[PDB]
Amino acid sequence: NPEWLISEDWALLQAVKQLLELPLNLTIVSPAHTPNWDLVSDVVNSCSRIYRSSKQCRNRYENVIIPREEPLRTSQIYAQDENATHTQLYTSHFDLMKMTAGKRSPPINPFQKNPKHASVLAESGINYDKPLPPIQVASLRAERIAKEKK
């Protein structure tokens, strides 16, 4: 799986912090406020990179956060360390790949009235040079229907 961005990591930390529970033991007084791992998962995968929020990752990366939170703190690494340069560089790479893909994509009066298209019609028995008015064509159709009926 792709590496975790510090932005989505701080987002996960805040989502866990917004569950009204402490990391010392994730079932605090008012035990009905058990940890909603699916909620923080939904809140995290809305970040820059791909979903990457299965049942495992949500617990694994929080258990990784706990040691380094109990070095710089996640909130400090978010406010510090080029706050928005990481996600912006990721998105710039994405846009560069987009442009490369879109660029390499493929771009995508000899009058000839040959005598074949007219010869087939002549063989069919109809004159092409002389346009038969629709009235005579209708009369011919009626005569053909009459012949068929007899």
């Binding site: 917004q18 009204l20 008012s30 035990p31 939904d42 979903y51 879109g102 064509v137």
Partner: protein, 1366 residues
């Protein structure tokens, strides 16, 4: 606790024993054991939710005593200290109801606070009336004494009932029923919140959100009535519940069945205005709801970079290539800005939008190779995109690696997607051909899809389209299973498997998705079919012995070619030519292909060239013509050559040559005279050259072409050609050449095709070309007697009524006119042919005449129309004087009204009704009323001629009459007077419901009237007391109808014409994308005119109007609905009192004050909120309202219809459909042309915009308007012909009306004036339609149109009677 209940659920004996054991453990010896209770919580909960009442009672009695008897303490307990995880898919909120109702006091008398519904006691009559009456009554056998004693004993027995007996039984009843108990919590929790003090409410609201999450309380995720759903509904239904996080709201909406409730809450937060998270979550949830329009509007409101708005506008209307280009430009500009300096983190959502929408666009544009190269990038592999776009290019190794990478991290919503991809892998992998687990994968995928379906709202919508599409591919994978099972060498060549393969291929060929689906799904289906088509082809190449006839490989080749051609056709229909050329270049790379499908490929190519030849260039069109001429025609058939020459003539008529095109059309029609399209296009060209050169020898030819094209084809297609035919009849000369032409070649055309145009040919029935049209209408009527009887009945009666006024000087009977005799001879012939059916129809019509009700509602409607006309004329005198005198016409109207005041075939029903009217006219009440009115309605006194004085007197009399007419019957039995209707039965005659033959249906299942229901109700609609008639059919369903008395034979006939126009335009909306995708359709009720004064219209019982809702809200507030107009006019008068003519600021401040004082813009919004308490129902109603309002506004703007007054708009509460009260073209009576140029294009008053919450307007409303504009703008539909055909008779009636005032020779208007006026009128609509259809640069004028529709600078100038505030 763990196993006894799992392995022995049915044997309730040991379960009850174990529950009694744990209850004893909890009850007795508590001082000794209190740690054991920790682990046995699931046992206690299960015993509490058991189905046995005694166990539940003994468990609740111990669960209640453990807590203080205080509502706040129990609420806090159940909200933060109690864990419901151990419950297990249970509706535990009923236990909350138990706990909250048990703490209530149950040692006091029972009572109720509903004083309005209190039942009076026996002795309550001792204090109601005055005193002395009862005082004298109080100072005034055994059979009665015993009764009184027993009754007093019984009453004493009742007074012993306490409130505790009610609550216990209420709770025991809520136990068994999950439904109607969720509602009890929803309705009781806010009541508890109301009594909680601020200190308690603050903490409770602050701790509820942790409880809304509550971690592992997710087993309810699959519960149909999930507990979190009810809890959040109740919490939101409170008054002060401000604090709730939008992220948790979106999570609950997605996971639990809270989609629409969550969206409503989020938008209610958003429209109250650190804070961008609300809009972010709302946009995410809208994109999750598949509601493209709301998402697009929200983002256009959020769009920072201008390119994003254009990209979203392009992608919203199917412009995928331009959308992709705009997205590329946007992200390039963003990359440049980033290289300049870092941007705020709030822009990341826009970047994700660009990413995913560029991915989607490239997916729609058949860029699978580019998508694979992108998702497979070394640094940022996107495994989901790769898994999606890998199998469509046969990259099975990449697909397998992406699958194994996704199966471990796939969203649970995409479980069925992962199953389908696993099946694709197992079926199509070269080195992993293991066809052992196939049906199991399909079963698991179907189960997961159904489980996801159970998580979606109950009202089907765009949210459910993904699963409805997935079903088809799942059943195809199931079929592919046996396909591959039969292609193996063990079964290869076997007839039993060959027949199954042939059948499955035929079914696939005959089973197709709909155009409303995106090209992505069409590709996902066709490419999946192509793999197995090729497998069939390849499988029959190494088994030359098996089936040695070169047929089964040809079968697969033909299947693949047909699938490719169908995919290209679908891509073309959606508006993609480049992908069409790509697919054509693809299909060209085959060793050999059939000759039948190559002709269809060439046909699709020439169709692409056709639809691309709108602004064709010389070079490109000549190259296309050369490519056309380069095709060989040696091994082809004959009819294909006819179609080819027809398309050639079309493409060359597109260019301004017109000679070789005529030759090619003639040659094609001679090659195959049965080819309908060729002859239709030839007739189109002939009509064009006739209208241009005006040669008589061409009109007959054009009409013959149209008729021969309409002969052998379906009516849906032939409609626009009959339209062209009917319009050409306005060019005939004195010799009537084209008349005899159409009369000579009409034998052969189906008679059903003329049903949709009976009114058009009836107007020509009165012209100099009569006799032949009479013969034709009689011939077509021999098959449909009623469809021709009703219209001729109405027209004959109208002609007789008109002649009665034309011969005012001659008393008694008079000689009939030529059209009268002409249309009555046909009725005589019909009665001779269909005597029973016509006699039953006559009986029905003569019985419904009894619906002439009385003088009360008659004079009420008369004075209502009088007040309406008074206001309409006063608006004209508003700005000038506003102290104006009544006009002569209005004076004559009111005089005639107050003089008649209600009393104004050889049949006997009319005579009996007149006798009854003269009889009931002998009472003194109505005589005294007439006297009092005549002593006031006289105008011969000074000071009463003022228009506003008349308006005030009319309002006074309106109030008096409405207070008088409130005591009348509301329904009557049909058997009282209508004997033949009550005695009507299916055995009498096979008569169909009125309005059935109007639109022909493919099937002949026409519901016949089984019998008329006995009850006939009276409903106040259209400012009149209409009579509602119910008719039942042989299917058991009931249809309501209103027998409306027009009282105006011209306005009703001009009104029911736009209904026919819309009904003709409705099919077209259903034949294009971006219209079916949005479910755009006109709601056109059925209206049939049975007589000049009466017409029968279809309706539904629950259909209010805007004015009805307004007056209902006013009555609720206790005010008069006529207050705002009177206030506007009072301000106008007081401003003009000092000579100053009211300026613009005057109107603006008047509107502002009347809106802020007695007409708040939030009236319709609160009305809708109260009407629809359910979030899903409210959302569906609002969406239907938005789309229907947009459609009718587009109609009333493009089509020059009269202003949509508030009382006209009918609003169906049961579906949300919006239909108006009979629009009509506002043709200028003076000039005779359409001048629909009001300040406001369509009704978008502040109340509506507030109901549409200001984003339904910017999104679905304008989106639907643009879609319907671009839809009708397509030339293939030829809506101009229908418009011309309708405007022909719309203007003929205008000319007839204008010439009647002065004074056969005058029976015909003119040979050149009528056509010129019709052409002038139709262009005014066509230009307005094209102006709206223009969508250059991702921008449209519809935005400026909707912006002007609600601008106060223009609304203030509208008519007060138009209610610019409602």
């Amino acid at each position: 606790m763990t196993y006894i209940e799992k392995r022995f659920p049915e044997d309730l004996e040991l379960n009850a024993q174990f529950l009694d054991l744990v209850n004893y453990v909890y009850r007795d010896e508590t001082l000794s054991g209190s740690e054991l209770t920790a682990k046995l919580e699931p046992a206690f909960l299960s015993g509490l939710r058991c189905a046995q009442p005694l166990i539940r009672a003994k468990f609740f009695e111990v669960f209640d005593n453990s807590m203080k008897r205080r509502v706040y303490e129990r609420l806090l307990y159940v909200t933060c200290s109690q864990n419901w995880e151990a419950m297990g898919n249970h509706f535990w909120i009923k236990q909350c109801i138990e706990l909250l109702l048990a703490v209530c006091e149950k040692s006091t008398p029972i009572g109720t606070s509903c004083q309005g519904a209190m039942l009076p006691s026996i002795t309550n009559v001792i204090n109601l009336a005055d005193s002395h009456d009862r005082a004298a009554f109080a100072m005034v056998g055994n059979q009665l004494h015993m009764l009184t004693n027993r009754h007093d004993k019984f009453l004493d027995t009742l007074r012993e009932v306490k409130t505790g007996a009610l609550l216990s039984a209420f709770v025991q009843l809520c136990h068994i029923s999950t439904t109607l108990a969720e509602k009890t919590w929803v309705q009781l929790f806010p009541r508890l919140w109301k009594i909680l003090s601020d200190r308690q409410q603050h903490a409770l609201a602050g701790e509820i959100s942790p409880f809304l999450c509550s971690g592992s309380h997710q087993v309810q995720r699959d519960c149909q009535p999930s507990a979190l759903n009810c809890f959040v509904e109740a919490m939101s239904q409170c008054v002060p519940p401000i604090p709730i996080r939008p992220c948790v709201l979106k999570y609950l909406g997605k996971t639990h069945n809270l989609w629409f409730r969550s969206t409503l809450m989020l938008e209610h937060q958003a429209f109250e205005k650190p804070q961008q998270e609300i809009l972010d979550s709302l946009a995410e949830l809208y994109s999750l709801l598949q509601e493209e329009d709301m998402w697009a509007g929200l983002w256009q409101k959020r769009c920072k970079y201008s390119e994003t708005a254009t990209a979203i506008a392009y992608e919203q209307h199917g412009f995928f290539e331009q959308a992709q280009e705009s997205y590329e430009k946007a992200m390039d500009k963003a990359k440049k800005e980033h290289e300049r300096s870092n941007a705020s983190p709030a822009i990341f959502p826009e970047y994700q939008l660009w990413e995913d929408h560029w991915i989607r666009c490239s997916k729609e544009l058949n860029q699978w190779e580019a998508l694979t190269e992108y998702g497979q990038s070394k640094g940022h592999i996107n495994p989901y995109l790769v898994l999606e776009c890998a199998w469509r290019v046969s990259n099975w190794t990449a697909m397998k690696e992406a699958l194994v990478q996704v199966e471990v991290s796939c969203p649970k919503e995409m479980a069925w997607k992962v199953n389908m991809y696993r099946g694709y892998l197992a079926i199509c992998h070269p080195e992993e051909q293991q066809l052992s687990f196939i049906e199991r994968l399909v079963e698991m995928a179907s189960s997961l899809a159904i489980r996801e379906w159970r998580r979606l709202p109950h009202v089907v919508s765009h949210v459910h389209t993904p699963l409805l599409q997935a079903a088809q591919q799942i059943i195809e994978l199931q079929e592919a299973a046996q396909i591959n099972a039969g292609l193996q060498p063990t079964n290869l060549g076997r007839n039993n498997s060959l027949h199954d393969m042939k059948t499955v291929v035929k079914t696939w060929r005959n089973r197709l998705p709909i155009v409303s689906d995106d090209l992505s799904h069409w590709s996902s289906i066709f490419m999946w079919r192509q793999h197995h088509y090729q497998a069939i082809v390849t499988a029959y190449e190494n088994s030359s012995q098996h089936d040695p006839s070169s047929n089964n490989a040809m079968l697969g080749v033909h299947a693949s070619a047909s699938a490719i051609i169908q995919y290209g056709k679908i891509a073309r229909k959606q508006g993609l030519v480049n992908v069409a050329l790509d697919i054509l270049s693809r299909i060209h790379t085959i060793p050999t292909v059939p000759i039948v499908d190559c002709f269809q490929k060439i046909r699709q190519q020439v169709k692409c060239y056709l639809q691309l030849a709108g602004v064709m260039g010389k070079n490109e069109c000549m190259q296309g013509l050369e490519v056309i001429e380069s095709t060989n025609l040696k091994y082809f058939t004959k009819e294909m050559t006819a179609e080819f020459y027809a398309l050639k003539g079309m493409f060359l008529a597109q260019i301004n040559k017109s000679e070789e095109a005529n030759k090619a059309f003639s040659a094609a029609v001679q090659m195959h005279d049965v080819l309908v399209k060729a002859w239709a296009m030839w007739g189109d060209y002939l009509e064009n050259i006739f209208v241009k050169e005006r040669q008589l020898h061409l009109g007959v030819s054009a009409i013959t072409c149209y008729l021969h094209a309409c002969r052998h084809q379906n009516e849906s297609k032939s409609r626009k050609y009959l339209a062209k035919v009917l319009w050409l009849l306005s060019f005939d000369d004195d010799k009537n050449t084209l008349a005899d032409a159409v009369d000579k070649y009409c034998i052969g055309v189906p008679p059903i095709q003329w049903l949709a145009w009976i009114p058009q040919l009836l107007t020509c029935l009165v012209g100099s070309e009569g006799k032949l049209l009479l013969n034709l209408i009689s011939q077509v009527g021999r098959v449909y007697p009623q469809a021709v009887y009703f219209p001729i009945r109405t027209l004959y009666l109208t002609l007789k009524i008109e002649q009665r006024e034309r011969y005012k000087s001659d008393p008694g009977p008079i000689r009939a006119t030529a059209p009268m005799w002409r249309c009555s001879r046909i009725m005589h012939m019909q009665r001779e042919l269909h005597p029973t059916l016509l006699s039953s129809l006559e009986g029905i019509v003569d019985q419904m005449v009894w619906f002439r009700e009385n003088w009360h509602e008659e004079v009420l409607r008369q004075l209502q129309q009088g007040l309406a006309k008074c206001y309409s004329v006063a608006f004209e005198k508003s700005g000038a004087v506003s102290d104006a005198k009544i006009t002569p016409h209005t004076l004559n109207f009111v005089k005639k009204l107050v003089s008649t005041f209600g009393v104004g075939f050889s049949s006997a029903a009319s005579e009996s009704l007149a006798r009854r009217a003269q009889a009931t006219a002998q009472d003194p009440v109505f005589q005294k009323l007439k006297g009092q009115f005549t002593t006031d309605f006289d105008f011969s006194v000074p000071g009463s001629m003022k228009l506003h004085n008349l308006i005030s007197k009319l309002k006074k009399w309106i109030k008096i009459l409405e207070a008088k007419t409130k005591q009348l019957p509301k329904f009557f039995l049909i058997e009282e007077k209508c004997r033949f209707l009550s005695n009507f039965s299916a055995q009498t005659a096979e008569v169909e419901i009125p309005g059935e033959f109007l639109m022909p249906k493919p099937t002949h299942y026409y519901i016949k009237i089984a019998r008329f229901m006995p009850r006939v109700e009276i409903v106040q609609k259209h400012n009149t007391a209409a009579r509602r008639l119910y008719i039942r059919g042989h299917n058991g369903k009931i249809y309501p109808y209103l027998v409306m008395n027009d009282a105006c034979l011209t306005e009703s006939r001009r009104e029911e014409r736009v209904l026919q126009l819309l009904r003709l335009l409705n099919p077209c909306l259903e034949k294009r994308k971006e219209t079916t995708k949005r479910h755009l359709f006109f709601t056109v009720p059925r209206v049939v005119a049975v007589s000049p004064q009466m017409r029968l219209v279809e309706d539904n019982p629950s259909s209010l109007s805007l004015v009805e809702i307004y007056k209902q809200r006013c009555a609720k507030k206790g005010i008069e609905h006529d207050n705002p107009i009177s206030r506007y006019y009072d301000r106008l008068a007081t401003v003009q009192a000092r000579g100053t003519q009211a300026s613009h600021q005057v109107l603006r401040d008047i509107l502002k004050e009347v809106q802020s004082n007695m007409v708040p813009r939030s009236m319709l919004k609160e009305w809708a909120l109260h009407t629809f308490p359910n979030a899903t129902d409210y959302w569906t109603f609002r969406k239907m309202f938005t789309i229907q309002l947009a459609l009718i506004g587009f109609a009333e703007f493009v089509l020059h219809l009269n202003r949509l007054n508030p009382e006209m708009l009918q609003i169906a509460q049961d579906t949300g459909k919006l239909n108006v009260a009979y629009f009509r073209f506002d043709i200028n009576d003076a000039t005779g042309d359409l001048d629909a140029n009001r300040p406001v294009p369509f009704r978008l008053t502040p109340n509506i915009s507030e109901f549409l919450t200001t984003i339904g307007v910017s999104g679905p409303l304008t989106a639907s308007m643009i879609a319907v504009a671009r839809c009708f703008a397509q030339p293939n539909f030829k809506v101009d012909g229908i418009l011309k055909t309708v405007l022909r008779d719309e203007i003929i009636a205008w000319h007839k009306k204008t010439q009647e005032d002065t004074s056969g020779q005058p029976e015909n208007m003119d040979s050149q004036q009528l056509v010129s006026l019709v052409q002038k009128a139709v262009t005014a609509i066509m230009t307005r339609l094209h102006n709206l259809a223009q969508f250059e640069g991702g921008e449209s004028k519809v935005n400026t149109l909707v912006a002007a529709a609600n601008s106060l600078d223009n609304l203030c100038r509208m008519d007060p009677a138009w209610h610019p505030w409602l």
